[PDB]
Coordinates of C-alpha atoms and ligand atoms in Angstrom, one line a residue:
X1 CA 17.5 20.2 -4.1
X2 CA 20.2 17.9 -2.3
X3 CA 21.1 14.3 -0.9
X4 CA 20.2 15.0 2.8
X5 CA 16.6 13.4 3.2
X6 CA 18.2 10.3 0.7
X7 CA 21.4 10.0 3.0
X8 CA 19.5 9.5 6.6
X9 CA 16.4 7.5 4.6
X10 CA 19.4 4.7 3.2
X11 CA 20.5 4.8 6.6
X12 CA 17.7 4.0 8.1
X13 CA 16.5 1.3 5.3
X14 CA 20.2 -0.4 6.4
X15 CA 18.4 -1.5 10.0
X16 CA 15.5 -3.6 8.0
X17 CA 17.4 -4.9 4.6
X18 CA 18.7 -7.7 4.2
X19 CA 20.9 -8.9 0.8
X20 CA 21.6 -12.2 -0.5
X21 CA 24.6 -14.4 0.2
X22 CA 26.4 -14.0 -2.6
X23 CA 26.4 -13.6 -6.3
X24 CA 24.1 -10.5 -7.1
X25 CA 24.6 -7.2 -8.8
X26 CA 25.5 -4.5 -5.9
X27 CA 24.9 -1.5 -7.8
X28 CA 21.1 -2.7 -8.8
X29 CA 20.5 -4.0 -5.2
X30 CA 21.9 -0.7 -3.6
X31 CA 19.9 1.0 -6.0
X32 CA 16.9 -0.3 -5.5
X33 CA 17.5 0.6 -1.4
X34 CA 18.4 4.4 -2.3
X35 CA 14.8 4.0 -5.0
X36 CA 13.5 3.0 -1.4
X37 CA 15.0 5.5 0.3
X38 CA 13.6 8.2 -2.0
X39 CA 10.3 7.7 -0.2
X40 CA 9.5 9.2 3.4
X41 CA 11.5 8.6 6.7
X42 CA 8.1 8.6 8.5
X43 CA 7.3 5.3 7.2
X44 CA 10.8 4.2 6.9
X45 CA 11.4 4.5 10.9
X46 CA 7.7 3.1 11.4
X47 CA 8.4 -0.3 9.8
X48 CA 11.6 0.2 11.8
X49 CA 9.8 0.1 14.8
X50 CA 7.6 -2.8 13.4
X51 CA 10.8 -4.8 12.7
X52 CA 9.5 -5.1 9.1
X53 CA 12.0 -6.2 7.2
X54 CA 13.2 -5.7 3.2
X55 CA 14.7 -9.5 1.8
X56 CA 16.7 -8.7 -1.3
X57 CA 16.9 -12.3 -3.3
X58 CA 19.3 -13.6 -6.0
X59 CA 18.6 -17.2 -5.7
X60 CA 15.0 -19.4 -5.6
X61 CA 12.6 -18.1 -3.0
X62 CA 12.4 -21.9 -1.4
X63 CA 15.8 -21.1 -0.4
X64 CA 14.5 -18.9 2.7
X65 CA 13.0 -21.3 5.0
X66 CA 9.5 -19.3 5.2
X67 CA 9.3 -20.2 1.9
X68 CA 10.0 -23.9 2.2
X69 CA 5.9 -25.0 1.6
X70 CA 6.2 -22.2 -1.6
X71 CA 7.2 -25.0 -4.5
X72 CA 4.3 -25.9 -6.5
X73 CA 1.6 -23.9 -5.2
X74 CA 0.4 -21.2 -8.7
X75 CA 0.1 -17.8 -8.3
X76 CA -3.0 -15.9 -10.5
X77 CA -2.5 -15.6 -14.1
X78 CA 0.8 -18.1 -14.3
X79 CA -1.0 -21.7 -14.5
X80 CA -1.0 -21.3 -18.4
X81 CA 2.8 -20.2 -18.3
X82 CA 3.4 -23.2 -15.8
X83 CA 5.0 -20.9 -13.3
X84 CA 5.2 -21.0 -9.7
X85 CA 6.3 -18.2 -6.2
X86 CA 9.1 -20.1 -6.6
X87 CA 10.8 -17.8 -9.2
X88 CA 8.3 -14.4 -8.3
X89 CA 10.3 -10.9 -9.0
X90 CA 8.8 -10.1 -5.8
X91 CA 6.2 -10.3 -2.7
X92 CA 4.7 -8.9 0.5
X93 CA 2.8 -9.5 4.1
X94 CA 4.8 -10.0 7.4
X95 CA 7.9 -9.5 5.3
X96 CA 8.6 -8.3 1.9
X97 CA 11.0 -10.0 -0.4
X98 CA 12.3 -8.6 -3.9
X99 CA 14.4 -10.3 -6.9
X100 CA 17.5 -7.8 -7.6
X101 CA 17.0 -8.0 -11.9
X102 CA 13.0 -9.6 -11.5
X103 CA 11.5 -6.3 -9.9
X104 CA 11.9 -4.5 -13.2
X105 CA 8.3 -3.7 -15.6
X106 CA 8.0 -6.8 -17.9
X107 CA 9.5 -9.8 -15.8
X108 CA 6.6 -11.6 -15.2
X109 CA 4.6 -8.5 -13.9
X110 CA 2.5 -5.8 -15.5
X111 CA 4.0 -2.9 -12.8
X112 CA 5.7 0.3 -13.1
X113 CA 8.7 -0.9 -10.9
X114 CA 7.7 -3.7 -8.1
X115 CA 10.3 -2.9 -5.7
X116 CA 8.2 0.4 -4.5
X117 CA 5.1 -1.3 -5.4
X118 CA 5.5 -4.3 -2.8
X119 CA 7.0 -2.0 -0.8
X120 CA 4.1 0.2 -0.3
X121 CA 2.0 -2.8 -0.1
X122 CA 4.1 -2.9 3.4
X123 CA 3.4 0.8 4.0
X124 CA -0.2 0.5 3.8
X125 CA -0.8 -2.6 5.7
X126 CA 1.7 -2.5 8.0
X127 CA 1.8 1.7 8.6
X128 CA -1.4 3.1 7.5
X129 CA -3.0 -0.1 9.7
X130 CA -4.6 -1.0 5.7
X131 CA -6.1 2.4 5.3
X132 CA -6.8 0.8 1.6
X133 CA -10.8 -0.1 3.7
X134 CA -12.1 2.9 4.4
X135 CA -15.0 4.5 2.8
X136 CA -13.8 8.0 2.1
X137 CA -10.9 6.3 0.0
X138 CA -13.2 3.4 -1.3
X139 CA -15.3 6.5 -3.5
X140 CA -12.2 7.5 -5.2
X141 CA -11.0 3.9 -5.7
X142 CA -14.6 2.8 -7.1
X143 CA -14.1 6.0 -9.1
X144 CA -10.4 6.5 -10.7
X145 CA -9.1 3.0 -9.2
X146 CA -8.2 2.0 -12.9
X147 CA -7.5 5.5 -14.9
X148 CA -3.4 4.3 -15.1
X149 CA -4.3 0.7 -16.7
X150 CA -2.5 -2.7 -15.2
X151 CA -6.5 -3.8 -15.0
X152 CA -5.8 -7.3 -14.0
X153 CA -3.4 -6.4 -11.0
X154 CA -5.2 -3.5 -10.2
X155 CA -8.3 -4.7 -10.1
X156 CA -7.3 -8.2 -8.1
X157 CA -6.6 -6.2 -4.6
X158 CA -6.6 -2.6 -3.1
X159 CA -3.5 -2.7 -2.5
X160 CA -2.2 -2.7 -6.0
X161 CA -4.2 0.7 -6.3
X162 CA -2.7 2.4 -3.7
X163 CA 1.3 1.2 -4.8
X164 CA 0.8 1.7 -8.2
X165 CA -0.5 5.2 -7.5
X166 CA 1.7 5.6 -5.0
X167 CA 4.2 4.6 -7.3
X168 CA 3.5 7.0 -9.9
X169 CA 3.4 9.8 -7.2
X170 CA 7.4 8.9 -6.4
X171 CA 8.7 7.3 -9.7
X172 CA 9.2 10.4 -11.6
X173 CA 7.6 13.4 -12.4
X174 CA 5.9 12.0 -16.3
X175 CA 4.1 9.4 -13.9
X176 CA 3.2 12.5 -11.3
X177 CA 1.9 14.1 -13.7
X178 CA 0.0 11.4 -15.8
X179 CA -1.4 10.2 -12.2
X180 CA -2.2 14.1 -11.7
X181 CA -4.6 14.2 -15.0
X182 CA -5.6 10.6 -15.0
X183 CA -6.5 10.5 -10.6
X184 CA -7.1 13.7 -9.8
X185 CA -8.6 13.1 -5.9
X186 CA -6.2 10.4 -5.7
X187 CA -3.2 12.8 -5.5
X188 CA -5.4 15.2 -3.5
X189 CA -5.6 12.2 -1.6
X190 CA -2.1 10.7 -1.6
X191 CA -0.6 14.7 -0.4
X192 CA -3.2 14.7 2.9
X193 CA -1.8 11.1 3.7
X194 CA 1.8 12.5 2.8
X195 CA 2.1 15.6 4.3
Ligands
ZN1 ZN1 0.7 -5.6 -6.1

């Protein structure tokens, strides 16, 4: 196809991001926005007009003052590592805030990329109102919600079903088409949501 959707997406994403001070890597945090703005403008302009907006980070997360009580409290899984949200590749509720570098697979997190992951955990709470409760959904979930693997993210909140699927429906097309064969409803699903 062409750039068109991308061009007015990025564009839009600009009135909601929000990059770090200084001292980060441009073409990975720019990246990360046009990953972003890959997506769909229909969510895009409606956590526009929810004034949602996308923190980019370089530095320690107790460096943003809504963080400032985030120091020593121990996220799930990283009390044997000794870890703390104060070094997290990336997070989401009434704002979501990624690590340019930390939001790759592998950096402390079992996801496919966490930059479209926490993203959509915006989407569907924010957007969808948290579709992620209702019954119809909550078969298929129950059903298929595990098919793709990541079993103790993915099975800690509904959320992380959703994103990750969601993920693998706009990655690229190996991860449509393993989500395809491996959650079949869930991309019959995901297209009646979509469309
Ligand atoms: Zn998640």
């Amino acid at each position: 196809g062409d750039s068109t959707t991308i061009q007015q997406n990025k564009d839009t994403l600009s009135q909601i991001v929000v990059f770090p001070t200084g001292n980060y890597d441009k073409n990975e945090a720019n990246a990360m926005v046009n990953r972003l703005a890959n997506i769909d403008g229909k969510y895009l302009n409606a956590l526009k007009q929810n004034n949602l907006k996308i923190k980019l980070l370089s530095g320690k997360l107790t460096d943003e003052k809504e963080y400032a009580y985030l120091k020593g409290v121990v996220p799930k899984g990283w009390e044997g590592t000794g870890k703390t949200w104060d070094d997290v590749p990336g997070l989401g509720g009434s704002t979501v805030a990624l690590r340019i570098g930390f939001s790759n697979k592998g950096k402390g997190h079992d996801a496919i990329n966490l930059e479209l992951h926490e993203t959509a955990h915006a989407i569907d709470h924010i957007v969808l109102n948290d579709i992620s409760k209702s019954a119809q959904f909550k078969q298929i979930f129950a059903k298929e919600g595990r098919s793709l693997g990541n079993v103790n993210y993915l099975g800690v909140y509904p959320e992380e079903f959703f994103a990750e699927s969601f993920a693998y429906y706009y990655l690229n097309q190996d991860t449509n088409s393993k989500l395809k064969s491996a959650c079949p409803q869930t991309y019959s699903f995901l297209q009646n949501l979509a469309k």
